[PDB]
């Protein structure tokens, strides 16, 4: 079912955000991950 795919994305993007925050990373790169994480959660609750 499609929920697995959408749950997979938010888990993936959240996991990478933890990696980016852990090492020293710029503002541009971390902002893009936070932006993509926010978009992923949006798709899960109401796609479109």
């Amino acid at each position: 079912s499609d929920l697995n795919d959408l749950y997979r994305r938010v888990i993936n993007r959240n996991n990478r955000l933890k990696r980016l925050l852990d090492l020293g990373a710029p503002e541009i790169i971390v902002n893009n991950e936070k932006r993509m994480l926010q978009e992923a959660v949006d798709a899960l609750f109401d796609n479109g």
């Binding site: 959240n14 955000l17 933890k18 925050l21 902002n31 893009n32 936070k34 932006r35 994480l37 926010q38 959660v41 949006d42 609750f45 109401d46």
Partner: protein, 192 residues
């Protein structure tokens, strides 16, 4: 790791988002999706108490541009006098002095135009300090960096859903209701 905002409660009809924070939906799209800053908090009391000190720092800072402007203009004045005089003593062609002076004043205009950019940008950063009320969106990222670098511990600024979380923390919803009731009690037009 980083908080996010429910797609339902914002990004919908305005009977559900409600303008609970007095922000337009275009404003919200800019802040929570990392395209414009918000001033989540201002130390408005600090700013009043130390005001002459920050006033003293900007004023001496203002002096330096005037000293620098005086010298560049002095060099500009000397440059125009020197090239026209040297050409006219040689007399290689009919109008050597006029063409280079035309070229020389074009250079002065570029320097003068640059002088306008530096003073006005400095003027612009100062006036945004004086309008540092909370929930103020700030579109220009470069301008925010000039505010942040020149002075901290007075305005707290952020971006995204974390900024919104801070704003709701600092919300005083009972007082907002009272002021909204007063507008309903005495108001006219679409404002009501």
């Amino acid at each position: 790791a980083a908080p996010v905002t429910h797609i339902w409660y914002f990004k919908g009809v305005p009977s559900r988002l409600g303008y609970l924070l007095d922000l337009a939906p275009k404003d919200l799209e800019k802040v929570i999706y990392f395209a414009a800053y918000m001033i989540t908090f201002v130390d408005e009391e600090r700013r009043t108490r130390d005001l002459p000190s920050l006033e003293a720092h900007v004023s001496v800072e203002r002096q330096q541009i005037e000293q620098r402007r005086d010298s560049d203009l002095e060099a500009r004045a000397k440059k125009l006098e020197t090239d026209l005089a040297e050409l006219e003593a040689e007399g290689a062609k009919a109008d050597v002095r006029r063409k280079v002076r035309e070229g020389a004043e074009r250079e002065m205009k570029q320097l003068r135009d640059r002088a306008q950019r530096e003073i006005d940008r400095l003027d612009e950063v100062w006036n945004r300090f004086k309008n540092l009320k909370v929930q103020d969106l700030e579109g220009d990222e470069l301008l925010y960096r000039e505010l942040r670098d020149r002075f901290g511990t007075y305005f707290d600024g952020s971006m995204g859903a974390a900024a919104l979380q801070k704003r709701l923390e600092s919300f005083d919803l009972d007082e907002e209701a009272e002021r909204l009731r007063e507008i309903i009690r005495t108001g006219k037009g679409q404002k009501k």
